[PDB]
Ligand binder design. Structure first.
Ligand code: K
Ligand code: K
Lengths: 224, 227
């Protein structure tokens, strides 16, 4: 929590008056949103937020931040979100919290993307964290069998009570337990070209800046 | 009229490919309607034994009303043959589908199927695809943004509406944007672009899929072996 809070506080230095800002999810982002509300309510910062989730929208609105729908703004200047893993090549896995689709829709509209993470999220190669894939329910068992045959070690995502998780768009999630993803661009191409795959959790050539929480403070890394 | 008679002709001709014990994918549309009627006849009046796998809620409603057994696609381990319609078939046997808004489940079923047969009246045969607007199935969240990207890309998009003017919802509860492209000279490139767009679930280009086409002509059905 200590690392998350220094990073969330540092991140809001990137926000400028007049901006439209995408706000992501996670414990790390929660600290950032609190520090953003601080600036809005003490320093007169004027901005509009777009969020990847309800929980964040409700937090931002309780702080007096104006939130609009994605299709109500003509651009997003900067989106600040967390990540489940970030590799040495600055490719990400996201959607551990099941919102990979809306996260990618917000990221794609955004001019810049910043990810804020503690040190434990930085890996050499992606793949220890299971890769989520959003799948149309009808035929999802057959998609699962294709993934099993390819060697991707698929598992359907469950709610705490063991029922199938349904996403915001009413799809299922299949997590792939891959171990190591040496070629994420090849895997992403395979996945998106499978019938019934709506989106996957590889966020490739997206993040521009990363802020990493280390024991000695936040470190800023430029990706692209 | 003449067009209904051609659709009737190919729908009746198509059911000859159906044999006892097959698992058959059932398409969607006004031509498929005749085929499902013909299949029902063979089931109820000839004791033909098969299992159907549907591509839309409409087709399942028709098949159930006829006593055709329908199984979920994930309850069958293979599909022998799928018989569906098409909005356009090009001279190299590529298709546009989705005029009936069922492109996604149509493509899911076709992909499981060992063989795919399309049944059409002669008006469906084109040299190049594209006069018929290309349907694209899109996630609702962010779909105005997607629409604007297509507009900027010069793709002439239009959201699919019901007859009352409200937005059409597909069986999976997505929207459809039809693209008024006029002529599509490189459909593989176009398919690749569309599927790579965030928020696009599936598109109506059905490339290197169809095996057999039955075309209803003025002098009868012509069977074309595509691949
Ligand atoms: K896909
Ligand atoms: K897509």
């Amino acid at each position: 929590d200590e690392l998350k809070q220094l990073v969330g506080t540092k991140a809001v230095e990137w926000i400028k008056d007049g901006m439209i800002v995408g706000l992501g999810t996670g414990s790390t982002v929660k600290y950032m949103v609190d520090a953003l509300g601080k600036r809005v309510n003490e320093e007169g910062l004027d901005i509009v937020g777009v969020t990847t989730s309800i929980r964040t929208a409700e937090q931002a609105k309780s702080l007096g931040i104006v939130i609009k729908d994605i299709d109500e703004v003509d651009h997003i200047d900067l989106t600040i979100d967390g990540a489940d893993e970030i590799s040495s090549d600055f490719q990400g896995i996201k959607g551990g919290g099941a919102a990979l689709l809306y996260e990618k829709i917000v990221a794609t509209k955004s001019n810049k993307n910043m990810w804020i993470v503690d040190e434990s999220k930085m890996v050499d190669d992606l793949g220890q964290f299971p890769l989520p894939v959003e799948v149309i329910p009808y035929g999802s068992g057959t998609v699962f069998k294709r993934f099993e045959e390819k060697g991707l070690n698929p598992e359907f995502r469950k709610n705490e009570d063991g029922s199938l998780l349904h996403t915001d768009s009413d799809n299922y999630i299949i997590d792939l337990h891959l171990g190591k993803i040496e070629n994420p661009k090849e895997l992403g191409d395979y996945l998106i070209n499978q019938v019934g795959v709506v989106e996957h959790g590889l966020f490739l050539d997206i993040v521009n800046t990363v802020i990493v929480g280390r024991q000695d403070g936040p470190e800023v890394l430029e990706a692209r």
